[PDB]
């Protein structure tokens, strides 16, 4: 497919986010590249408005599943690449247990040779004393699966999963994710059978960076179908 062919090599990525959480406004710019052949993402995000008012790990899922490695035998299930280059809209509600929620709308598409993720995020009903606005999450990340179901009616897909965020006191904070993806173009896309993306994420810091930022190394592999 034309879409799939766009990902056979290393592709530059740009991520741009404008956020408002409980009235705390912030912006983030990210740059990196993706190599779908290996399901590999390398990305560095910088808060351009100063200090990020929420923990970096809470924004990982929001900050390009078109870079997932779909094994050859599963290639017909890759909705994300099939929608390229025109791209897709990705919307989520992320509900933090006993705390507030993020709602996100993003457009993921090519601008020239570069894969762009443009995001608007709104967070409401958070506790200033809570794990999120209080910055009580550990700077790490567990492996998680993303469960995908087709949405024939919208010519797209949906997904659900929960993220387990480790808390500094030894507990875990759950973040329930509802996700929907719909093509921007009106052309054909691949509608998958049920499957999941296995995702491992590693968070780090750039030793030469003084700004508030996050370095992300991530591997994403489609699975669940034999």
């Amino acid at each position, epitope marked *: 497919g034309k879409g799939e062919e766009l990902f056979t090599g290393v592709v530059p990525i740009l991520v741009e986010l404008d956020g408002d959480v409980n009235g705390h406004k912030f912006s983030v710019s990210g740059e990196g590249e993706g190599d779908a052949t290996y399901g590999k993402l390398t990305l560095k995000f910088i808060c351009t408005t100063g200090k990020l008012p929420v923990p970096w790990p809470t924004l990982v899922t929001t900050f390009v599943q078109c870079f997932s490695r779909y094994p050859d035998h599963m290639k017909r299930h890759d909705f994300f690449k099939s929608a390229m280059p025109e791209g897709y809209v990705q919307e989520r509600t992320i509900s933090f247990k006993d705390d507030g929620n993020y709602k996100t709308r993003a457009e993921v598409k090519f601008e020239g040779d570069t894969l762009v993720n443009r995001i608007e995020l709104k967070g409401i009903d958070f506790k200033e004393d809570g794990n999120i606005l209080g910055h009580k999450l550990e700077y790490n990340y567990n492996s998680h699966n993303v*469960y995908i179901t087709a949405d024939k009616q919208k010519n797209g897909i949906k997904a659900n999963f929960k993220i387990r965020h480790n808390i500094e006191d030894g507990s875990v904070q759950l973040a329930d994710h509802y996700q929907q993806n719909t093509p921007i173009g009106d052309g054909p896309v691949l509608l998958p059978d049920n499957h999941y993306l296995s995702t491992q994420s590693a968070l780090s810091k750039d030793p030469n960076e003084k700004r508030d930022h996050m370095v992300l190394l991530e591997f994403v592999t489609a699975a669940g179908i034999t």
Partner: nanobody
């Protein structure tokens, strides 16, 4: 909430079994309920859902043989299995969740817990001979 499965055990191929799962407490109807199963050395499978809105889904391999249902008075969910096959041998788990549930069925990973649910039963063995 505690979940307790019953109604499993040994059964002849071609036979039937009705699994039951009873929830404690007074908060059942708002939960989406699911049955998972895992055989030795295989990925866990979410075999059937019954969502809060009543919607049911089934893994392709059990469609037409398995029927999921719930009783919001007895706070129980059931899995009626007919024409059991050797392929159905596994430990079966009941689960309840109040988060996003869309009716996913199929493989979920090497641990049933990889598909995050609010509450889990300890499961019950079903062995088809």
């Amino acid at each position: 909430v505690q979940l307790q499965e019953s109604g499993g055990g040994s059964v002849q191929a071609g036979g039937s079994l009705r699994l039951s799962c009873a929830a404690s407490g007074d908060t059942f109807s708002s939960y989406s309920m699911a049955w998972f199963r895992q055989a030795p050395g295989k990925e866990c499978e979410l075999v059937s859902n019954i969502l809060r809105d009543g919607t049911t889904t089934y893994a392709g391999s059990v469609k037409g043989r398995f029927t999921i249902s719930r009783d919001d008075a007895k706070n129980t969910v059931y899995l009626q299995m007919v024409n059991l096959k050797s392929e159905d041998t596994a430990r079966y788990y009941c689960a309840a969740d109040s988060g996003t549930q869309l009716g996913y069925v199929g493989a979920v990973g090497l641990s049933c817990l990889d598909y995050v649910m609010d509450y889990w039963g300890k499961g019950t063995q079903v062995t088809v001979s």
